Design a protein around this ligand. Sequence first.
Ligand SMILES: NC(=O)c1ccc[n+]([C@@H]2O[C@H](COP(=O)([O-])OP(=O)(O)OC[C@H]3O[C@@H](n4cnc5c(N)ncnc54)[C@H](OP(=O)(O)O)[C@@H]3O)[C@@H](O)[C@H]2O)c1
Ligand SMILES: NC(=O)c1ccc[n+]([C@@H]2O[C@H](COP(=O)([O-])OP(=O)(O)OC[C@H]3O[C@@H](n4cnc5c(N)ncnc54)[C@H](OP(=O)(O)O)[C@@H]3O)[C@@H](O)[C@H]2O)c1
Ligand SMILES: Nc1nc(N)c(NC(=O)Nc2ccc(C(=O)N[C@@H](CCc3nnn[nH]3)C(=O)O)cc2Cl)c(=O)[nH]1
Ligand SMILES: Nc1nc(N)c(NC(=O)Nc2ccc(C(=O)N[C@@H](CCc3nnn[nH]3)C(=O)O)cc2Cl)c(=O)[nH]1
Lengths: 286, 285
Amino acid sequence: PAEILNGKEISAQIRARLKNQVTQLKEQVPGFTPRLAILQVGNRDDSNLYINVKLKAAEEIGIKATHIKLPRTTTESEVMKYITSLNEDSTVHGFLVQLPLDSENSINTEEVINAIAPEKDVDGLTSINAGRLARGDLNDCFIPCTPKGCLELIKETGVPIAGRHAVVVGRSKIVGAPMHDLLLWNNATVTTCHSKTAHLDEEVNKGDILVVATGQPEMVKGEWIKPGAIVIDCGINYVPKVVGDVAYDEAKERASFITPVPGGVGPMTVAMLMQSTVESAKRFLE
Amino acid sequence: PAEILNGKEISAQIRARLKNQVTQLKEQVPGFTPRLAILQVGNRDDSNLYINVKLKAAEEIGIKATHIKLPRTTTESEVMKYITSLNEDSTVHGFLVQLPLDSENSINTEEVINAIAPEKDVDGLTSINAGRLARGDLNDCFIPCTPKGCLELIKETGVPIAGRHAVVVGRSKIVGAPMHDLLLWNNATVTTCHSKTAHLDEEVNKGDILVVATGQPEMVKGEWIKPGAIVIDCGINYVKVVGDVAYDEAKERASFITPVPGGVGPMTVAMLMQSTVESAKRFLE
Ligand SMILES: NC(=O)c1ccc[n+]([C@@H]2O[C@H](COP(=O)([O-])OP(=O)(O)OC[C@H]3O[C@@H](n4cnc5c(N)ncnc54)[C@H](OP(=O)(O)O)[C@@H]3O)[C@@H](O)[C@H]2O)c1
Ligand SMILES: NC(=O)c1ccc[n+]([C@@H]2O[C@H](COP(=O)([O-])OP(=O)(O)OC[C@H]3O[C@@H](n4cnc5c(N)ncnc54)[C@H](OP(=O)(O)O)[C@@H]3O)[C@@H](O)[C@H]2O)c1
Ligand SMILES: Nc1nc(N)c(NC(=O)Nc2ccc(C(=O)N[C@@H](CCc3nnn[nH]3)C(=O)O)cc2Cl)c(=O)[nH]1
Ligand SMILES: Nc1nc(N)c(NC(=O)Nc2ccc(C(=O)N[C@@H](CCc3nnn[nH]3)C(=O)O)cc2Cl)c(=O)[nH]1
């Protein structure tokens, strides 16, 4: 049986560290707090929940986090007025737009995301930041939070990455594609799969490291896992109960390490957002 | 044995179609011509070779091509002066900095490259253009010219790319990394290799589509090639000129294969010409 990567536990350690950093930062420079702003369009149930989790992690740490919720009938111009405003407000060190937008009108997600100043793009979602990570310039940029938490979960096994074959399943802007670059520049040989991959099961079996962000409940079967694989599950799926993208029961019999859902990648994502936010508050002082 | 992919023939076709497009644009827009500029630093011989090749091609198509060659000792602040003038000059549609910079002073290639206006980065080397391609927004940007020509060559086989396993060997900013992005948003399943990969031979053998950009002459033996594979060799290695793949034994197993030279090479030059014509057309509107 595989060792559980206790995400709920591991993130607590990160947030406690982040708190001591923030508390020390207000005692070293008095009258200064990290300031985060999350922008939301519409009223998605899952978005409302994830936003609240992040607000809570920010309260516990010492981060002043605002939440702005625009209605569904919001126009793309209206959302730019908020982005413009947050870019130019020097008290705001990082901000993010929760995705996907829930708007009845037609909003160019890319145009909006890309109006964020790269030095506040704590979610690593601008083309500017994506281009650095996509080209290996990893200390110049914000790296998306879920890949960030995923990488830390991998290192917690102590198995070196470099020289190992990693299979990423899914190529999305927020998880799969940045996940691919992080593994590649940690010198894994990486294979990206997506919805058009033939013989997905044969590919998955090649993975020493296996990261799954498909949004397809328990679609990756345990028989597919390479024996002894490190298995990272990003899935959050609400079913007749919360499951992930990997069939957790069968896969734990073949993995050497596995993330549970919930309690795995989830808390790790929120912690790395908190970390990135602190990191941009420091860079602001310099 | 494998059908040979002819870059000389296919690129000569492309340059010709470019030519006629420029001719018709000049007819409709009297006195308007596409304008490229090639910045160089240092006096590397190979760079002078390839820069001439591009200048000739642009003169063939009717693209006005200027070549500025800064000395091996320039300062970073110097190249920024030129880069800024090129950015501000409205009669220049695109421009590029031949790489690698040959300088005595340590000069940040990244800061140099990222001062280029994205609207003129016909080489697709700016971080803004790299992140558009690397996240699937392919209309937004200039794709780098070599991956553009390898994609054109693969499509000359007529076998759709989707659902196929592609193995990209090499991860450089100029060939390897953008090649993975292009194949992935052509819906291939893509495996990316590099100098830390273990068992290169077994990864290569997975490749329905195989693109090699190592700069390690003939290092990919042809006994690793998956039988029937489409093989793209980006190498140019003086020893004569050979590629990154063992051409002889590869040709026996491939279904298609590019010769070194006259494979990717002329396609690279032709794709930069096409991107330049692209910049000019957009400029008019
Ligand atoms: N903290 C976290 O746990 C976290 C954070 C955010 C999201 N996630 C989770 O990750 C999952 C995916 O989110 P996302 O942002 O990546 O969503 P998405 O935009 O729907 O991405 C899904 C990806 O999976 C691929 N895919 C879909 N069906 C597939 C199949 N049958 N076989 C192979 N590949 C398939 C898609 O390929 P195509 O591009 O061809 O469609 C796409 O790249 C969700 O469960 C989400 O909750 C992780
Ligand atoms: N028009 C054309 O045909 C054209 C265009 C451009 C380039 N080229 C040719 O392409 C070749 C590569 O150029 P480049 O820009 O990619 O140069 P580079 O910066 O040296 O890139 C070489 C790449 O090969 C990878 N690699 C994989 N296996 C390797 C091994 N066993 N030994 C060494 N490297 C290995 C390296 O991975 P690491 O990152 O770990 O080093 C690296 O990413 C050269 O021969 C060049 O002349 C020609
Ligand atoms: N800009 C932008 N837009 C986006 N959409 C995202 N993605 C995102 O926020 N993801 C996200 C964040 C936190 C959790 C979490 O806290 N997970 C816990 C508890 C879940 C649970 N549910 N029921 N019981 N527990 C667990 O999984 O254990 C889960 C997820 Cl998916 C983004 O990151 N940036
Ligand atoms: N910004 C920037 N910087 C860069 N360094 C590059 N790279 C680049 O230009 N490469 C390049 C360009 C053209 C050729 C070519 O014309 N090949 C011919 C003849 C070769 C030959 N040599 N000796 N004998 N034959 C053939 O292969 O047929 C070959 C190469 Cl490597 C870039 O693209 N953009």
